[PDB]
Design a protein around this ligand. Structure first.
Ligand code: NA
Lengths: 270, 270
């Protein structure tokens, strides 16, 4: 085990660039708070939460998790992610974050190729792949965001064919760059939508098929999440959970009670 | 005073993406250590050091500075910088760092437009300008890296004319975007060199002239540093200090004794 094993269900909270430091510290302390009933021992092996703060609060986030773990004797209660990293270990790359340093701060997962980075900064498939490779070199699980870049046509087979093939071009360089035994998580979100479960189910089913065709027998496990902004009710009553191994929570999740509500939803669906 | 006043001499240590977290914590604790004789009370009003760590260690760096300040009763002993920031306050910008959050962590200065970011990521003059504006909105001093993008010709007046005019295109959008009363620091390094003091002196003199021509009477103060990798002896005996208001220290500065040696050099030149 070079890598943490992946539970069947993954819930991800990415704070993007929305939170101030004090709000991030209060927030992660709310997640861990036992009276908040978000993190249950009985969920440990089936359901996992990741918090993905901005780079500045990874340190005190990591410190908060540790302090909470020291309350018990020796799955972590909560995974800590970063929202990006560089494609090299250490070096002369001003403004860039090292996966070496991330691992030293007990980050377990790195979000890569977000739609926002692809649109604003022109981040490419090759770059996301090299980034995944460097994250994996440090024992970090790549979490690669994928999705169709085009507005799709009105013929469904054409539309599903395009979307899946556009995801294929994003998946292939990542799997080529990664060791076959390193785990990877792909988060799907159709970039032109800014949640149709029929559409998600169909493209995700085409994604899993794509992966099986490239490397059916790789030892590293694979998970496909919904990367879109998911609201209360979508997972269970909306059927989203029948299609994917997890999801990103939308901005309702900025309130701890919202997160509590969605964990309950997820428990009920299992 | 919306901004810290700028001393006549600025020394900058940017760690780029070279240091692990424990090495950064040890390092800043070495800078502050009184037996290391790097930070002298007698230097306070004439010479200032900035440390510019990676985003992950800004928090414990800030914490270390505070803890040291609490050893005395209420110029900071050491400025804390970041190596980049985003051009907006808060929002949906995955992987980006907010100048709001930086200020909340007692960062006083933001390095922008580094040659490494301009080359690797295609970072543009417009983007560096918008970044400077957002840093200034939060009371942060922009530190904009500038320099000629071309290999220069063999006729000196042509070469100096080009280099200065290429710096002009980088300076102008920054001054346009900044309030006239916000301070700005420009760090010069000819991108094609990968230290000729004659060349630096000549282009820096053309830079100060350029600035005076754009906005002779702005209230915000301006400093021009050498952004190249400066080694021991270059400032005083090499004459660099007669041309610029400070410099970036080269990799020799990774050793605390190196920093000590260069502070002594600088003291002697004043
Ligand atoms: Na970045």
């Amino acid at each position: 085990p070079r890598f943490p094993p992946l539970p069947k269900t993954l819930l991800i909270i990415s704070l993007k660039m929305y939170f101030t430091p004090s709000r991030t510290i209060d927030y992660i302390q709310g997640l861990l708070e036992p009276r908040n009933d978000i993190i249950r021992q009985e969920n440990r092996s089936r359901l996992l939460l990741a918090l993905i703060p901005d780079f500045l609060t990874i340190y005190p986030c990591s410190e908060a998790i540790k302090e909470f773990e020291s309350n018990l004797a020796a799955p972590p209660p909560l995974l800590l992610g970063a929202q990006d990293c560089f494609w090299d270990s250490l070096g002369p790359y001003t403004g860039e974050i090292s996966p070496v340093c991330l691992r030293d701060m007990n980050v377990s997962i790195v979000e890569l190729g977000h739609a926002e980075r692809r649109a604003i900064f022109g981040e490419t498939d090759q770059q996301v792949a090299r980034k995944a490779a460097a994250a994996a070199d440090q024992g970090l699980i790549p979490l690669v965001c994928i999705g169709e870049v085009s507005t799709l046509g009105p013929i469904v087979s054409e539309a599903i064919g395009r979307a899946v093939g556009e995801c294929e071009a994003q998946i292939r360089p990542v799997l080529e760059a990664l060791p076959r035994d390193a785990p990877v998580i792909f988060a799907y979100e159709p970039v032109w939508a800014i949640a149709r479960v029929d559409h998600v189910g169909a493209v995700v089913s085409g994604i899993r098929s794509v992966i099986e065709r490239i490397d059916r027998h790789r030892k590293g496990e694979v998970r496909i999440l919904y990367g879109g902004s998911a609201g209360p009710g979508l997972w269970g009553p909306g059927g989203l959970g029948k299609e994917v191994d997890g999801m990103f929570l939308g901005r309702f999740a900025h309130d701890i009670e919202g997160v509590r509500k969605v964990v309950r939803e997820v428990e009920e669906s299992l």
